[PDB]
Structure formats: C-alpha cells, structure tokens
From TrEMBL:
NCBIfam families: PRK00982.1-1, PRK00982.1-2, PRK00982.1-4. Its main location: cytoplasm. One of its GO terms (molecular function) is acyl binding. Belongs to the acyl carrier protein (ACP) family. It comes from Streptomyces coelicolor. One of its GO terms (cellular component) is membrane. The keyword Lipid biosynthesis applies. GO terms for biological process: lipid A biosynthetic process. This is Acyl carrier protein. It is found in: Cytoplasm. Acyl carrier protein involved in meromycolate extension. Carrier of the growing fatty acid chain in fatty acid biosynthesis. HAMAP family: Acyl_carrier (MF_01217).
Amino acid sequence: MAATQEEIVAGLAEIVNEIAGIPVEDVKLDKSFTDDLDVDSLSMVEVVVAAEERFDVKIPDDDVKNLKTVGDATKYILDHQA
C-alpha cells in the first residue's frame, strides 16, 4: 500500500531502532545508514528489508546495502512502492 515519506519513515525508523538505535524522530533522508545509523550492510538488509515488505514495496534484498543513507532507501522505496 502506498505510504508517503513520513508514513514509511515512521515504519522504517521503528525498525532500524531494532538494528542500531536512531530515534524515530532523528530518522531523516539526510542521515547515512552506514555512518549515522551505524548500521552494517547485513544488518540494514535484514531488518530494513523487513521494513520494506511491511509497506509492500519491491526492492532487491542486496540493494539495501547499496543505499548509503536511510533516506536514499526511503525515496527508492517510495518510487518502487505498491
């Protein structure tokens, strides 16, 4: 189902908090997954893929490691959302 930036960000934030610990309000399209989120390529792909499918979007598993920011993910999720 189609969710916009803040909607999907909330669901994304909630889930990255499971991986590392960026506050739900701190989750922005400007903070880097690898840097700010302090997440690992595997780590991000694990629970953040669990985050993609929960809104019903389609992105390749490994592709989450390609996005260096949480926001880069979101916009890609926002482009490829169903």
